[PDB]
Ligand binder design. Structure first.
Ligand code: COA
Ligand code: CJ7
Ligand code: NA
Length: 396
């Protein structure tokens, strides 16, 4: 049972493992496109002794964090162990090797999307974005008098085919991802995949349509089985006008009873309507998970809230060092120290705090971060908060 970087001959075996492990696996063509995002020495495999019984890799990503700062990020993916080789330490072996490689390569953070919620906490990953399914009964939906773009004259939104306006979607998304925490650069190969998914599948999903604004787009399709439900697969808006204008068009889908979307907790859609309750929250889950590889690099790169005044403290990460943390003027300075720790937390807790999705007081209330100073908690809460709400870019 050896561990090594895969050769070209291993990849058919990896796709076999992938097809058996992931129900969303499409095929070798799709997989080969995703594989272009994996750097040299970015993948590991476990062979028996021969066949592939384990695999894991990371992709080179660009993550937006608070203060519109873009970090290079190791995006873990394609993780799998054969059902024939469970409970044998293969994952712990593969993740440890990948983390060593990720750390030596100079990534300040690593990230993933979790198949199950109870697995990745022990490897230092904490949930850092929150997914939020809204389901609107659009038959009762009426916009508030204050809602933008609710005057007489021509509309700003166009109904279009996705494939014919790729360039406009890319431009809008690129603007969006740069200014929002949790935003990810989407490479050309993933735009290829996205647009391939938009076409009607024989005995699969229906044809997708697009609603296009200069500062926003929405992509949607009617649900396969429920013909009165429209699923918004993606909605990106750079301005509030664009966001409201797109939802006026979506609520204009008079054929449908319901419109469903996966969004974030701060989505302003409920407040656009006269009845806020019509935007029902039907589902709730962790989105992006974050492992801080380098604590001082991560903490110093991020922007902080200007509202809180200058303060100093001592943070210990359980097996990630102890640091003198000084935050002021929306910036942080994070230097080594052996002075007594004022705050203590595991590595994964810092990941959950990092983008501002989880408050430090909430994690403190669960005893996931220890501190005897409640004033320090209030300051951390405010400092680590993000003025632009945290969002989830795309799954990987
Ligand atoms: C590996 C996998 C599916 C389960 O297999 P597994 O046999 O439990 O993994 P291992 O036994 O090698 O892992 C060793 C340790 O991890 C834990 N799992 C075990 O409890 C064990 O710890 P312990 O010995 O202290 O109890 C699972 O851990 C996993 O979550 N993989 C996710 C795949 C995925 O989500 N891929 C897409 C990208 S996130
Ligand atoms: C994420 N990834 C990969 C990463 C590296 C790689 F060398 C191949 C792949 C790869 N192949 N097929 C697929 S199909 C599943 C696509 N799904 C992404 C997550 C959300 C839903 C769609 N996904 C892959
Ligand atoms: Na295992």
């Amino acid at each position: 049972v050896t561990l090594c970087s895969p050769t070209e001959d291993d990849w058919p075996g990896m796709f076999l493992l992938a097809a058996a492990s992931f129900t969303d696996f499409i095929g070798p063509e799709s997989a080969t496109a995703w594989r272009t995002l994996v750097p040299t020495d970015g993948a590991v495999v476990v062979r028996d002794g021969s066949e592939v019984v384990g695999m894991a890799l990371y992709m080179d990503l660009r993550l937006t964090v608070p203060g519109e700062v873009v970090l290079p990020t190791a995006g873990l993916s394609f993780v799998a162990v054969a059902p024939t080789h469970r409970r044998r330490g293969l994952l712990r072996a593969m993740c440890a090797e990948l983390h060593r490689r990720i750390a030596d390569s100079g990534y300040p953070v690593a990230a993933l999307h979790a198949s199950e919620g109870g697995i990745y906490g022990r490897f230092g990953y904490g949930p850092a974005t929150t997914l939020h399914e809204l389901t609107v009964d659009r038959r009762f939906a009426r916009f508030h008098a204050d809602a933008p773009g609710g005057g007489l004259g021509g509309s700003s939104v166009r109904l279009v085919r996705p494939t014919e306006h790729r360039g406009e979607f890319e431009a809008i998304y690129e603007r969006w991802r740069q200014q929002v925490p949790g935003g990810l650069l989407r490479p050309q190969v993933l735009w290829d995949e996205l647009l391939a998914e938009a076409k009607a599948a024989p005995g699969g999903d229906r044809e997708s349509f697009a609603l296009l604004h200069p500062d926003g787009y929405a992509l949607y399709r009617v649900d396969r089985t429920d013909l009165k439900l429209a699923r918004v697969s993606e909605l990106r808006a750079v301005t509030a006008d664009a966001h409201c204008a797109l939802w006026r068009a979506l609520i204009g889908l008079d054929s449908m009873e319901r419109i469903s979307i996966i969004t974030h907790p701060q989505d302003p859609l409920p407040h656009l309507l006269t009845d806020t309750r019509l935007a029902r929250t039907t589902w709730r889950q962790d989105g992006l998970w974050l492992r801080i590889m380098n604590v001082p690099a991560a903490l110093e790169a991020r922007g902080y809230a200007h509202e809180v005044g200058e303060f100093s403290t001592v943070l210990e990460v359980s097996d990630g060092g102890r640091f003198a943390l000084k935050i002021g003027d929306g910036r942080a300075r994070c230097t080594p120290t052996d002075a007594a720790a004022e705050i203590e937390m595991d590595r994964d807790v810092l990941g959950s705090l990092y983008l501002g999705a989880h408050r430090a007081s909430t994690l403190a209330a669960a005893n996931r971060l220890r501190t005897k100073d409640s004033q320090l908690l209030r300051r951390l809460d405010a400092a680590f908060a993000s003025d632009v709400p945290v969002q989830t870019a795309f799954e990987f």
